[PDB]
PDB file of C-alpha atoms in Angstrom:
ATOM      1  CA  UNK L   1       0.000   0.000   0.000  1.00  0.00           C
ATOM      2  CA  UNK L   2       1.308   3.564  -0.046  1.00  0.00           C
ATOM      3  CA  UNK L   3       0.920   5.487   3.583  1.00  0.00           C
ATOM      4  CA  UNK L   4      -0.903   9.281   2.560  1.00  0.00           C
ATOM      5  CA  UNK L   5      -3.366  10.329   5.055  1.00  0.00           C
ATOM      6  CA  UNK L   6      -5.430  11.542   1.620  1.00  0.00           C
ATOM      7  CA  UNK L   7      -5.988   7.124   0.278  1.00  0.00           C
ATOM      8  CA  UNK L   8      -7.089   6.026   4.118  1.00  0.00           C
ATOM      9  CA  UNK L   9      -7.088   7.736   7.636  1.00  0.00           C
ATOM     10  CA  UNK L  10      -8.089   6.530  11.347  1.00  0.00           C
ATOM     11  CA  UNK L  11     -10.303   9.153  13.335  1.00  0.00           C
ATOM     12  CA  UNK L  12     -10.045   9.698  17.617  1.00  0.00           C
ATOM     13  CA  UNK L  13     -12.610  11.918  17.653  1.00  0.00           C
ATOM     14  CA  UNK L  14     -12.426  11.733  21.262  1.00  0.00           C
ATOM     15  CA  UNK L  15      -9.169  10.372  23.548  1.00  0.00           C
ATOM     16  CA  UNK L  16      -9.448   8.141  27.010  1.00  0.00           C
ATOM     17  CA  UNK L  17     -10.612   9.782  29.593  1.00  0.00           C
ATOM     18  CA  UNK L  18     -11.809   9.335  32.941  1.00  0.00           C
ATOM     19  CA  UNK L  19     -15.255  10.846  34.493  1.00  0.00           C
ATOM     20  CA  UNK L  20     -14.892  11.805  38.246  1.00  0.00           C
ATOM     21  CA  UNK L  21     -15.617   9.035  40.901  1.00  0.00           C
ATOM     22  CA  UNK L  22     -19.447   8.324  41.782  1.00  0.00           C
ATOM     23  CA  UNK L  23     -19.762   7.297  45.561  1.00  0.00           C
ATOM     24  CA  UNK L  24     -21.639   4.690  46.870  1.00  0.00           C
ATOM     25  CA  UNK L  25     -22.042   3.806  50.630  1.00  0.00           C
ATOM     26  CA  UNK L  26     -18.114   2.791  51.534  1.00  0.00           C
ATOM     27  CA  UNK L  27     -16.681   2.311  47.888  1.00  0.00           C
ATOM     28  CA  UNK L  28     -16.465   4.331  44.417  1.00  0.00           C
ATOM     29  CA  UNK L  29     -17.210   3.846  41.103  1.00  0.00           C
ATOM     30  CA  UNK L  30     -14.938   5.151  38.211  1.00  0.00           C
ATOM     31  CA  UNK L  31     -16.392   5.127  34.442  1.00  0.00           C
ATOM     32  CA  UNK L  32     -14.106   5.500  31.633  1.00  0.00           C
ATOM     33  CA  UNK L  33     -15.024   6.493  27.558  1.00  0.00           C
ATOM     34  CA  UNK L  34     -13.390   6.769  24.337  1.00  0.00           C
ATOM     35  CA  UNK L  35     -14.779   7.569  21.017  1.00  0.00           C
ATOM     36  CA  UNK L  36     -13.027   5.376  17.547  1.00  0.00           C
ATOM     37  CA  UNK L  37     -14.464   5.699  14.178  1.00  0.00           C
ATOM     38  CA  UNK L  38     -12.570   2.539  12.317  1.00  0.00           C
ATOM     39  CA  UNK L  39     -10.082   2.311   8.959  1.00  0.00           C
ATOM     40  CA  UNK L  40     -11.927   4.372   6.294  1.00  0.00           C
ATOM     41  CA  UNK L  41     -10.307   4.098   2.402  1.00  0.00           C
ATOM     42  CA  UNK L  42     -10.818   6.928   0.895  1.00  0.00           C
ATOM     43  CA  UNK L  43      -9.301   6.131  -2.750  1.00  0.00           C
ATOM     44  CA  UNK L  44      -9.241   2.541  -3.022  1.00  0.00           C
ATOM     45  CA  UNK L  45      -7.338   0.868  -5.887  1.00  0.00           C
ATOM     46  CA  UNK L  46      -4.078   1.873  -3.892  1.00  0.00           C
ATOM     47  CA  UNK L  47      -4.421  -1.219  -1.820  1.00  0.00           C
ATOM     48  CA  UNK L  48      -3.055  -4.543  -3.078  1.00  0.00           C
ATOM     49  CA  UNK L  49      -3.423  -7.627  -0.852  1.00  0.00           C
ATOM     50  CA  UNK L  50      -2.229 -11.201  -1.388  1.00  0.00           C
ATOM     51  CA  UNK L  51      -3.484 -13.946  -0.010  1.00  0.00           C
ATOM     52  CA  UNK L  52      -3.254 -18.065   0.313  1.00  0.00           C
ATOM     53  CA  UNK L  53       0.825 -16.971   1.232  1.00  0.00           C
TER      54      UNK L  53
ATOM     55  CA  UNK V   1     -42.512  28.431 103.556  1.00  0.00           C
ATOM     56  CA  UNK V   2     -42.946  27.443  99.995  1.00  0.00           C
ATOM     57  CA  UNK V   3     -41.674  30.670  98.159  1.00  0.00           C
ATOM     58  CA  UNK V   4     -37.982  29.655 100.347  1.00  0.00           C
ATOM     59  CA  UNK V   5     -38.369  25.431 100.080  1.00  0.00           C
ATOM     60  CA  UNK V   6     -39.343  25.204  96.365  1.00  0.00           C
ATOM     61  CA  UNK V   7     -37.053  27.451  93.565  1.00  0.00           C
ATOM     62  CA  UNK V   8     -38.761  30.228  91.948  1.00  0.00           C
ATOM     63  CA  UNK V   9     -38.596  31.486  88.338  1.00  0.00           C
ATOM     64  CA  UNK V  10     -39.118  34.112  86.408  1.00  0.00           C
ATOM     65  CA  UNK V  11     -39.802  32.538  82.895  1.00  0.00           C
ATOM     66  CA  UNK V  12     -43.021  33.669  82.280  1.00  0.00           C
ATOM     67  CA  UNK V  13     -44.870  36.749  81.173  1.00  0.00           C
ATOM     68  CA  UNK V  14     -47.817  38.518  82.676  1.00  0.00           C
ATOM     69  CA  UNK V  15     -50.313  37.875  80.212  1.00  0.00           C
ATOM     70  CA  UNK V  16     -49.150  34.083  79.227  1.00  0.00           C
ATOM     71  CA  UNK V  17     -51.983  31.749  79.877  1.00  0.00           C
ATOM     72  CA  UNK V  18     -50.497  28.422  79.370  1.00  0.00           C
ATOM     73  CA  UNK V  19     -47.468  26.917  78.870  1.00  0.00           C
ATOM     74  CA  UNK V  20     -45.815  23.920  77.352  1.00  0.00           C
ATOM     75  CA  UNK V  21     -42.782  21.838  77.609  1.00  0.00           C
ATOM     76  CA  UNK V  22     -40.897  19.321  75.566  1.00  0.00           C
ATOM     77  CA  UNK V  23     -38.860  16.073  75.875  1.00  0.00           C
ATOM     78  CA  UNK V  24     -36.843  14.247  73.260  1.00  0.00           C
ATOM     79  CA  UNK V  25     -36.137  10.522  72.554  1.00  0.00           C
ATOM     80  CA  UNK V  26     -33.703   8.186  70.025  1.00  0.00           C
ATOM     81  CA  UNK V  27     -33.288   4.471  69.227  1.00  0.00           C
ATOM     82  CA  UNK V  28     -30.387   2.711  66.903  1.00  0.00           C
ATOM     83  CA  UNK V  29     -28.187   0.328  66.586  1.00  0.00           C
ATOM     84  CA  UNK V  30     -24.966  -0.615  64.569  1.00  0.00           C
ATOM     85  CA  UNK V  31     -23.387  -3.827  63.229  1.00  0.00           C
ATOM     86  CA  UNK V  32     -19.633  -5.404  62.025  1.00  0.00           C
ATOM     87  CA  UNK V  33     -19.609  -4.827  58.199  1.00  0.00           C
ATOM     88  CA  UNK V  34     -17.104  -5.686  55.318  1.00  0.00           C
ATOM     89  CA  UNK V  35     -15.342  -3.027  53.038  1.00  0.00           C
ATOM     90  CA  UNK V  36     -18.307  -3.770  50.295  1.00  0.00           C
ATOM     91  CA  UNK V  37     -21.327  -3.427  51.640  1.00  0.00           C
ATOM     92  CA  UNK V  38     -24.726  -1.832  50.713  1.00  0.00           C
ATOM     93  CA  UNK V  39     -26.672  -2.275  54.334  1.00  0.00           C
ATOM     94  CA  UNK V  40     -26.606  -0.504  57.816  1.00  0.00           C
ATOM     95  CA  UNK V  41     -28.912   0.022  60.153  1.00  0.00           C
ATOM     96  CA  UNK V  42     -30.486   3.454  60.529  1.00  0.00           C
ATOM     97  CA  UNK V  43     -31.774   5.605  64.087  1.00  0.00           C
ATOM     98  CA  UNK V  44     -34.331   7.955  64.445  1.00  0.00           C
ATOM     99  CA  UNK V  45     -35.751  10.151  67.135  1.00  0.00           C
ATOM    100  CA  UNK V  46     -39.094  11.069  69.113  1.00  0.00           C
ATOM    101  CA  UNK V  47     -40.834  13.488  70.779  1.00  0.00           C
ATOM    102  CA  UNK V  48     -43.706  14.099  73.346  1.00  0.00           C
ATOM    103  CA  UNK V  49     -45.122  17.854  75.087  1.00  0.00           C
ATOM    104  CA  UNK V  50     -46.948  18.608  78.188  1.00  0.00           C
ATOM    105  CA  UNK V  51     -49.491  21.751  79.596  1.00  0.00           C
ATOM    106  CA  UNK V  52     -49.996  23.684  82.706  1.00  0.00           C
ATOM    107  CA  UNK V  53     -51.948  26.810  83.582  1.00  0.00           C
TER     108      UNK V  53
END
């Protein structure tokens, strides 16, 4: 393949974080989020794969 | 020899026509627990008034 962010790209539309601790009776709870979108081609055609190697 | 056996007060205006005290009360209880738990016992209180004239 050839690496140019203009043929295929990765999106983080949002980095790891972590929310501020809920409290329960003795103990806490901590959620944590993240937002991903996935490979996206753009221009295929620039992609060769070979398989059965 | 009342007004120098029994205590006198003051606590009281000319015109008042009855009066009214109060008295207070509480139960509860506690336990052993763990470092996770989601249960303890609770308390509470009371009350009760009297009259005069």
């Amino acid at each position: 393949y050839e690496k140019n962010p203009m043929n295929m790209s990765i999106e983080i539309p949002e980095a790891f974080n972590m929310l501020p601790a809920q409290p329960k009776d003795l103990h806490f709870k901590v959620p944590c989020t993240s937002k991903c979108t996935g490979l996206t081609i753009y221009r295929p055609m620039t992609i060769v794969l070979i398989t059965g190697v | 020899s009342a007004l120098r056996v029994f205590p006198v007060t003051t606590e009281l205006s000319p015109t008042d026509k009855t009066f009214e005290y109060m008295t207070f009360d509480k139960v509860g209880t506690a336990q052993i627990i763990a470092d996770y738990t989601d249960d303890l016992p609770l308390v509470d209180a009371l009350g009760t008034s009297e009259f005069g004239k």
